[PDB]
């Protein structure tokens, strides 16, 4: 169940020869030279990308139905499950009486990218999408409104739908 780590003329001469002639130092140098002659694992960014998964948590997006009509139904589960309180929702019924949203703001400098909103959405409207290269220069640009989220959804629908099709049976 347990073991004792570090509990251990020819041998004395071998130790003295290792002292004077540096046997184990030569061994360590040989391993260093072994690692010199291998193929380095540097991938050619940005022309090459690291491996990922269809479950990758990236940029927030708002999806749509396959008829043009938006998916969010103003149920406020995402802002109730959000651990960082980064989601602000204000809702009202529009002209046709459909329960939709008027303000859907995500503070992306508050968001912790944990995917609770993408799993608490009953109609799969909000999705933590796949995009990770969305660094900005100003603080206000990382403060998405509803129009930016809808534009991101219409931008990345062609792969978000495929990722959902690939992953939805594990949920």
């Amino acid at each position: 169940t347990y073991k004792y780590v570090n509990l251990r003329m020819k041998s004395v001469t071998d130790r003295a020869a290792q002292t004077l002639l540096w046997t184990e130092l030569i061994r360590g140098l040989g391993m260093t030279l072994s690692y010199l002659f291998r193929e380095p694992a540097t991938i050619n960014y940005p022309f090459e990308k690291g491996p990922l998964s269809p479950r990758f948590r990236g940029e927030h997006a708002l999806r749509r139905y396959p008829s043009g009509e938006e998916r969010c139904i103003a149920c406020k589960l995402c802002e109730a499950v959000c651990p960082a309180q980064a989601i602000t929702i204000e809702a009202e019924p529009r002209a046709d009486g459909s329960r939709r949203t008027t303000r859907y703001d995500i503070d992306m400098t508050k968001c912790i990218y944990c995917g609770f909103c993408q799993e608490a959405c009953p109609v799969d409207a909000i999705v933590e999408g796949p995009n990770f290269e969305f660094s900005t220069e100003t603080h206000e640009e990382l403060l998405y409104n509803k129009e930016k989220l809808l534009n991101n959804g219409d931008k990345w629908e062609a792969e978000i739908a495929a990722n959902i099709q690939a992953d939805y049976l594990y949920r």
Binding site: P46, K110, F132, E137, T138
Partner: protein, 150 residues
């Protein structure tokens, strides 16, 4: 003066020397970026521990109220030109600990931030993208042309 501006922008952007200023999870993500998988050193990016010989500073982690004078002094000891890259969500807007009593709500209040990198933690490929965006920002600088116009 247009071509001399093109020269010194190439010299500064291809030999960026960051400083070893990490604080939290995001520091381990930076160390993962500096691994052989992504290899910051291929871009002319070699870690230097002293603020007096550093070009940029990547603030990784949560900046608390006990840490703001230290970050301010470290930034004030860096020679010009200097750029600050915010990282994660803690150094962006507080992130998870935005409403806490002892967390600065974004490190913009202490130092002027040039490049915002979003994530928690941001992926090392995204961080490389942010550093390349900073390099492209350095490339389009117009110092000597503006000096000639003035």
């Amino acid at each position: 003066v247009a071509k001399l501006d093109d020269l010194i922008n190439w010299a500064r952007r291809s030999s960026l020397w960051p400083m070893t200023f990490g604080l939290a999870c995001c520091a381990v993500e930076m160390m993962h970026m500096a691994a052989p998988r992504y290899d910051m050193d291929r871009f002319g990016v070699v870690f230097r521990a002293s603020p007096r010989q550093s070009d940029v500073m990547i603030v990784a982690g949560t900046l608390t109220n006990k840490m703001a004078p230290a970050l301010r002094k470290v930034y004030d000891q860096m020679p010009e030109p200097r750029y600050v890259v915010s990282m994660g969500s803690c150094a962006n807007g507080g992130g998870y600990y935005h409403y806490s009593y002892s967390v600065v709500r974004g490190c913009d209040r202490i130092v002027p931030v040039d490049i915002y990198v979003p994530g928690c933690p941001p992926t090392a490929e995204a961080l490389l993208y942010g550093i390349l965006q900073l390099q492209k920002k350095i490339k389009r600088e117009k110092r000597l042309r503006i000096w000639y116009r003035r």
